[PDB]
Amino acid sequence: SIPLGVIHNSALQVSDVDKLVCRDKLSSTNQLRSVGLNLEGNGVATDVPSATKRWGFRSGVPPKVVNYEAGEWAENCYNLEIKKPDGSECLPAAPDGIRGFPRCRYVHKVSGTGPCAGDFAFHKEGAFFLYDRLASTVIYRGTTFAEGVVAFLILPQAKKDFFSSGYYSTTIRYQATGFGTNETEYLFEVDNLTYVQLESRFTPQFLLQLNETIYTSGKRSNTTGKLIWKVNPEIDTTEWAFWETSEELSFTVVXXXXXXXXX
Amino acid sequence: SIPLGVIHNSALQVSDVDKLVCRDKLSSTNQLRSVGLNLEGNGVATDVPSATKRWGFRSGVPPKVVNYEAGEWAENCYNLEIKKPDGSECLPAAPDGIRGFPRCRYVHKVSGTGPCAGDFAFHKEGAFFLYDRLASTVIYRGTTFAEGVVAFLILPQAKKDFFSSGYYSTTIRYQATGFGTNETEYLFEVDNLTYVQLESRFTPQFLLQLNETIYTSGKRSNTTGKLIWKVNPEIDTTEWAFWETSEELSFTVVXXXXXXXXX
Amino acid sequence: SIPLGVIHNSALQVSDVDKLVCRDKLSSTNQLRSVGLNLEGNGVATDVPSATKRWGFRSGVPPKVVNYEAGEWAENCYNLEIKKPDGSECLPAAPDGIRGFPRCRYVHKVSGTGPCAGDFAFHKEGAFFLYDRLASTVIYRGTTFAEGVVAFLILPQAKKDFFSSGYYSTTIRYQATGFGTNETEYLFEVDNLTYVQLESRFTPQFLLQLNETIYTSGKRSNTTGKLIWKVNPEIDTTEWAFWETSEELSFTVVXXXXXXXXX
Amino acid sequence: EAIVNAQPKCNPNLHYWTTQDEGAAIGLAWIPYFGPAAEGIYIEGLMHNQDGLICGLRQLANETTQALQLFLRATTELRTFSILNRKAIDFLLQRWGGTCHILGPDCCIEPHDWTKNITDKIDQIIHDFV
Amino acid sequence: EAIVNAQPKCNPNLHYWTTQDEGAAIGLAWIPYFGPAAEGIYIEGLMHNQDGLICGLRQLANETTQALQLFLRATTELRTFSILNRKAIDFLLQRWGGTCHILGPDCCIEPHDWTKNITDKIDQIIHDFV
Amino acid sequence: EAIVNAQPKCNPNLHYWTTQDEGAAIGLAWIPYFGPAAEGIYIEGLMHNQDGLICGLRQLANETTQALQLFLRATTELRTFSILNRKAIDFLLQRWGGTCHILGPDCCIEPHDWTKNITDKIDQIIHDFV
Numbered sequence A, B, C: 001s002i003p004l005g006v007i008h009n010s011a012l013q014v015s016d017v018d019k020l021v022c023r024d025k026l027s028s029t030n031q032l033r034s035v036g037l038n039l040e041g042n043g044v045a046t047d048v049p050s051a052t053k054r055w056g057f058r059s060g061v062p063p064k065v066v067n068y069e070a071g072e073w074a075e076n077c078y079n080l081e082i083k084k085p086d087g088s089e090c091l092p093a094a095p096d097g098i099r100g101f102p103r104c105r106y107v108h109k110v111s112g113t114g115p116c117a118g119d120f121a122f123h124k125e126g127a128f129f130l131y132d133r134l135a136s137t138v139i140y141r142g143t144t145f146a147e148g149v150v151a152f153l154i155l156p157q158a159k160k161d162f163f164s165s166g167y168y169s170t171t172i173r174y175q176a177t178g179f180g181t182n183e184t185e186y187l188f189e190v191d192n193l194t195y196v197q198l199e200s201r202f203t204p205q206f207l208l209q210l211n212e213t214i215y216t217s218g219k220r221s222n223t224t225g226k227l228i229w230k231v232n233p234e235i236d237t238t239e240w241a242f243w244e245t246s247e248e249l250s251f252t253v254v255x256x257x258x259x260x261x262x263x
Numbered sequence D, E, F: 001e002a003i004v005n006a007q008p009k010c011n012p013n014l015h016y017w018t019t020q021d022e023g024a025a026i027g028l029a030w031i032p033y034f035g036p037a038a039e040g041i042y043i044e045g046l047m048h049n050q051d052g053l054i055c056g057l058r059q060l061a062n063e064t065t066q067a068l069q070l071f072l073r074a075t076t077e078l079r080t081f082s083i084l085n086r087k088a089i090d091f092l093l094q095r096w097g098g099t100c101h102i103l104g105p106d107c108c109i110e111p112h113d114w115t116k117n118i119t120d121k122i123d124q125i126i127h128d129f130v
């Protein structure tokens, strides 16, 4: 059976389907709630290289969608525009009435290419892709999602403190090659000709600070060609979870153009 | 909460959600009914110029549809084919399984152009567009609707007299410019080159009589160009609601051709 | 009302809606079951010529779909690719999430032409076309179905023996002209240039044996043109229902090529 | 609440249409292939304003709109068919969602005839005390 | 009504397929990415005609068709999934939709053990009358 | 079962969003034409880990996934909206799906006040035995 959460003896438990508790009271369908919870909140790595390894392509399995009524504000959401090397789309367009996840601090928007060896992209750990009050087994094209899971509850009619500063969202753009494989490569986009080679250890706050440093220091490409900066390991960056947590960078340049950013 | 109608003390009332009346009996889902009622029945102006001012275009709001099981025969329904000046469609095609309102005495079919500054056309007073047992927040292209609202009832199982001459429908065609704005202009269509300048005061019965007079008197266009008749204010026409309610017209002609119809 | 099956006094009966039996127990929605049963199981003729006469085209009636949870393994299923003589499709594409019937011993795949005088193809006896846990009033293009009907049951919670060698399926291909009419003609396909003229009396087992005899005897077309074999009436073939039930064939040849297969 | 019609006019008669959800079919007319087209499935009738129910119903539909529109804004279903079934469930949960305490104002169990079974049975042992 | 099979034949055995709605999953097989394709989600079994239930069921499905087709003609849902849930609601409303009058033929409350609680309690004060 | 959080971390606070399914509308804001766009229909709040409910809820969602995924594999609906309504129906059928035998462990009828009606009525005829 699908588990149902209930509060007994000041503690949340799964409802036992064998037993019958006559003191349990369900006086309205309003006491029943579905809730989406973000994998973020369990301490999983949220950087793009770590996150994308949890997703994979597969054929033969029809997609499935289930609604949920309330969700959690996310620090990290993702939005994918992946094509095959031949230019065809890897991900289907969002079905009618499936809009993006409504509360994201950072939207990690990834564009690029991969082999995409399967009709739909699924979560390898069996989690869902959370959209606007609809959770799907698959990723839709160009549509912001959070990784998450769904719970179902009987709320006690007494406890009213159960789902009743502004909202700001920032898009972080990435280019990718070999998407959905072992040899995937990511670049953080400063502008259309200025990039930074991406590491797992880079937080959103570091990426945004690095980009603002590049703009103000004047280390963008002043040439028709592509400028890819690199950050060697002795550069500091922000293992702590998001809820519990300048003029020092020297840039040096080594068709194309590779380069190093030292400290 | 969504109100629910119930009959107590020989009178229809909204069911009180706080109270519990144990004498109320719901022995089947058949006792529950949804009903569509036409704005017509509340005395609203039904002429095309008045009716179309109640509708407006808006973006950012997803459309929504709700079913209803029984409806009211309408005197006036509407069917819109509006384009922008560039030829693109202002209204979306009817979704699968949304057919026109099933009982209309007059279908006011309007074709023409407007700026259509929004993705969907909504009712400015929050009413619905009633189709075949589906009520929508928006207007679909080329699909006959009545303006209306929905009620929900618990019927008493005793009263069987609650939803258990032929049916004739007439299409009245109009051309429009500046649709959905302040300076909208309407023409009643007699044939493809013969028109009448529309006023709010013209009833369907007057329009049909005027058209039949024009045909039999022989005052249609006998020329490649467009003939637009006008009716100056001293001409009589049928303020009473529809449920409670010749050789005297002299025509005179003033590229194009304007003209007056006197009495 | 829609009938509901219940077991009383060791016998299945329709539940009486007027009566109320307090000893009847429905302790879960799991006790409610919808089941698809195949027309096959009632002894109807399953050969393609007999089967296709039960289907017909009609306009003005919207299609309808209803789910069912459990079904019966079919001996005979059908899959239709019919066009009009002008090349346009007679049948609509399968809607999203409508897949073929999951257990068919023989899939009778018919390709060809007919007048198709109607927007959808319905069952003339009011039966359904059974797909993967969805029963439809209409035939979808290129999608395997069984002819069947649906029952609804309250299972007794005691009787657990109620819906809890491998599965092999064989496609038998046919070409048709004048599909859905009185003068329909069918050919069984051995290869793309070798055919057999179809009779109602030919079982799937006979068709497969005949084809294997043609291949091993070497009586396929060895020419650019079409070879159509015929079987005159003194040839034996397998009136018994499917659940209760060589080197002797001499071939002789009479642009095109007609011929006879004797015994 | 009581229903107070506050509209400019009221058409006091309701010429309605609906479907026959369970028609007593006439031979083969129930078979989709032979039956009526979409336009021919309707039945009609006429209701008058006995007990002011037509004028009440027009007003009820009007007043229902706000809550219905707010419900539709909050749902993600494109087409909503479940409002009446949800009302039925809530009817049942209101009465039978907890323990039914007999003689309480929220328990719909009548033991009046059950008293007459045992109040007739006062004399089954107190009168027969030989 | 009783079910009378009036078909030309009856296959008395039912080789069925269905889904395991709650499978006891084997490691990671429940994860869509790793699990079976659409064709591999079925379980099978075989039911015989004990109590004539298979032949009854074939006839029941046949007889169900008219009312089901008339129901589908009258609905505007393109795909109907709610028939069994509506049956469940109607089961409940038939019994619990009004006031339950104890000892009535339409109230499913049994007070037999409740009599034994109070009929054992006749002697709690009439026998102890010291 | 008890809920045991077995995750690497737990964010003990839940900054949530949801819709106001029944907003106390402000003038004409309920009318779709005038109201907010899709992005402006949300309300927010913050729940803390009183009674360990946030950490329990994260674990509950995690543990729910397998059964939910197996349910979605077995359904043919493309979008499932009916899980909570089906829970409500099953809540009711568990209690009221059969005959309610009073004083049994599966009947949720309380006759305690009903005893006090008739135990007060012992003296209605045994004390008044003039």
Ligand SMILES: *[C@@H]1O[C@H](CO)[C@@H](O[C@@H]2O[C@H](CO)[C@@H](O[C@@H]3O[C@H](CO[C@H]4O[C@H](CO)[C@@H](O)[C@H](O)[C@@H]4O)[C@@H](O)[C@H](O[C@H]4O[C@H](CO)[C@@H](O)[C@H](O)[C@@H]4O)[C@@H]3O)[C@H](O)[C@H]2NC(C)=O)[C@H](O)[C@H]1NC(C)=O
Pocket (backbone or CB within 6 Å): A042, A124, A125, A126, A127, A149, E028, F006, F007, F008, F062, F063, F065
């Ligand atoms: C509910 O909550 C639980 C607990 O948090 C989650 O449990 C996770 O389950 C997944 C399986 O789906 C686990 O993922 C797998 O981890 C394996 C072990 O990883 C460790 O291995 C190295 C070497 O020992 C360690 O140094 C390091 O700590 C690693 O973390 C991997 O072997 C697996 O990868 C391999 O198999 C998979 C097959 O799925 C392939 O795709 C890979 O390519 C690779 O070959 C895999 O990554 C995860 O570790 C579990 N976490 C914990 C904390 O136990 C559930 O996922 C969660 N449920 C939902 C629905 O979210």
Ligand SMILES: *[C@@H]1O[C@H](CO)[C@@H](O[C@@H]2O[C@H](CO)[C@@H](O[C@@H]3O[C@H](CO[C@H]4O[C@H](CO)[C@@H](O)[C@H](O)[C@@H]4O)[C@@H](O)[C@H](O[C@H]4O[C@H](CO)[C@@H](O)[C@H](O)[C@@H]4O)[C@@H]3O)[C@H](O)[C@H]2NC(C)=O)[C@H](O)[C@H]1NC(C)=O
Pocket (backbone or CB within 6 Å): B042, B124, B125, B126, B127, B149, D006, D007, D008, D062, D063, D065, F028
């Ligand atoms: C339920 O039933 C009630 C009662 O019948 C309906 O009430 C109507 O509500 C709408 C609002 O949605 C009203 O429409 C508004 O009327 C205003 C007043 O109109 C009068 O103003 C002049 C000058 O005083 C009078 O001479 C004349 O009598 C007019 O009728 C207008 O000011 C409004 O227009 C302006 O604001 C709107 C914003 O919505 C703009 O779109 C316009 O461009 C314009 O700037 C507006 O027309 C209506 O008057 C009410 N009727 C009555 C009888 O009170 C509900 O609508 C109904 N509910 C549903 C869902 O149908």
Ligand SMILES: *[C@@H]1O[C@H](CO)[C@@H](O[C@@H]2O[C@H](CO)[C@@H](O[C@@H]3O[C@H](CO[C@H]4O[C@H](CO)[C@@H](O)[C@H](O)[C@@H]4O)[C@@H](O)[C@H](O[C@H]4O[C@H](CO)[C@@H](O)[C@H](O)[C@@H]4O)[C@@H]3O)[C@H](O)[C@H]2NC(C)=O)[C@H](O)[C@H]1NC(C)=O
Pocket (backbone or CB within 6 Å): C042, C124, C125, C126, C127, C149, D028, E006, E007, E008, E062, E063, E065
């Ligand atoms: C539930 O189960 C019952 C019982 O098995 C099924 O009953 C069948 O109902 C259909 C009607 O829909 C019957 O089909 C019709 O049979 C008529 C008689 O056929 C016999 O006629 C000749 C001459 O007398 C006999 O020699 C021979 O035995 C034939 O079988 C035909 O006249 C009908 O065809 C004509 O009318 C139809 C109109 O529907 C046209 O389309 C045709 O072109 C033609 O003009 C028609 O074929 C069938 O015979 C019944 N069977 C039995 C055993 O009685 C139900 O169909 C079943 N329900 C479902 C939903 O499956």
Ligand SMILES: *[C@@H]1O[C@H](CO)[C@@H](O)[C@H](O)[C@H]1NC(C)=O
Pocket (backbone or CB within 6 Å): A182, A183
């Ligand atoms: C991909 O992963 C590693 C590279 O990190 C490589 O050694 C391995 O061979 C590749 N896997 C497969 C299945 O080819």
Ligand SMILES: *[C@@H]1O[C@H](CO)[C@@H](O)[C@H](O)[C@H]1NC(C)=O
Pocket (backbone or CB within 6 Å): A192
């Ligand atoms: C960057 O490129 C994209 C298209 O790839 C374009 O939409 C955008 O305007 C470009 N921006 C600049 C600053 O050139």
Ligand SMILES: *[C@@H]1O[C@H](CO)[C@@H](O)[C@H](O)[C@H]1NC(C)=O
Pocket (backbone or CB within 6 Å): A170, A171, A172, A173, A190, A208, A211, A212, A215
């Ligand atoms: C990069 O920095 C520039 C300079 O202020 C800013 O305009 C741009 O939005 C930054 N990029 C991101 C992703 O924030």
Ligand SMILES: *[C@@H]1O[C@H](CO)[C@@H](O)[C@H](O)[C@H]1NC(C)=O
Pocket (backbone or CB within 6 Å): A217, A218, A219, A220, A221, A222, A253
């Ligand atoms: C132009 O780009 C070079 C690197 O290619 C960089 O060193 C320099 O700062 C840029 N020019 C200016 C004026 O900043």
Ligand SMILES: *[C@@H]1O[C@H](CO)[C@@H](O)[C@H](O)[C@H]1NC(C)=O
Pocket (backbone or CB within 6 Å): B182, B183
């Ligand atoms: C449109 O309406 C009137 C004309 O009737 C005009 O005076 C007014 O300026 C216009 N409204 C707007 C918003 O421009």
Ligand SMILES: *[C@@H]1O[C@H](CO)[C@@H](O)[C@H](O)[C@H]1NC(C)=O
Pocket (backbone or CB within 6 Å): B192
């Ligand atoms: C009028 O014009 C329409 C196309 O705009 C056409 O369908 C119709 O046949 C025309 N009728 C006549 C009488 O010319």
Ligand SMILES: *[C@@H]1O[C@H](CO)[C@@H](O)[C@H](O)[C@H]1NC(C)=O
Pocket (backbone or CB within 6 Å): B170, B171, B172, B173, B190, B208, B211, B212, B215
């Ligand atoms: C206009 O009058 C003619 C002449 O009888 C008629 O054929 C036509 O249908 C009339 N138009 C309408 C809209 O009734």
Ligand SMILES: *[C@@H]1O[C@H](CO)[C@@H](O)[C@H](O)[C@H]1NC(C)=O
Pocket (backbone or CB within 6 Å): B217, B218, B219, B220, B221, B222, B253
């Ligand atoms: C031809 O049209 C004129 C107006 O342009 C009208 O006066 C006249 O009656 C028409 N001809 C006939 C024969 O009716």
Ligand SMILES: *[C@@H]1O[C@H](CO)[C@@H](O)[C@H](O)[C@H]1NC(C)=O
Pocket (backbone or CB within 6 Å): C182, C183
């Ligand atoms: C088709 O059926 C027969 C041929 O078997 C033919 O005699 C009859 O005239 C045809 N039916 C119709 C309606 O034309």
Ligand SMILES: *[C@@H]1O[C@H](CO)[C@@H](O)[C@H](O)[C@H]1NC(C)=O
Pocket (backbone or CB within 6 Å): C192
């Ligand atoms: C037979 O023809 C079909 C196309 O009509 C084709 O797909 C198939 O490969 C052909 N087979 C052979 C053996 O030629």
Ligand SMILES: *[C@@H]1O[C@H](CO)[C@@H](O)[C@H](O)[C@H]1NC(C)=O
Pocket (backbone or CB within 6 Å): C170, C171, C172, C173, C190, C208, C211, C212, C215
């Ligand atoms: C026809 O016989 C050949 C020869 O073995 C075989 O390959 C083919 O599958 C047969 N056709 C069918 C429909 O079984």
Ligand SMILES: *[C@@H]1O[C@H](CO)[C@@H](O)[C@H](O)[C@H]1NC(C)=O
Pocket (backbone or CB within 6 Å): C217, C218, C219, C220, C221, C222, C253
């Ligand atoms: C070639 O086809 C002919 C019939 O056209 C047939 O008799 C003969 O057996 C075939 N050839 C061989 C070698 O089998």
Ligand SMILES: *[C@@H]1O[C@H](CO)[C@@H](O)[C@H](O)[C@H]1NC(C)=O
Pocket (backbone or CB within 6 Å): D117, D121, E115
């Ligand atoms: C209830 O009433 C009947 C008479 O109608 C009586 O014979 C019976 O004994 C009573 N029930 C019990 C349990 O005593």
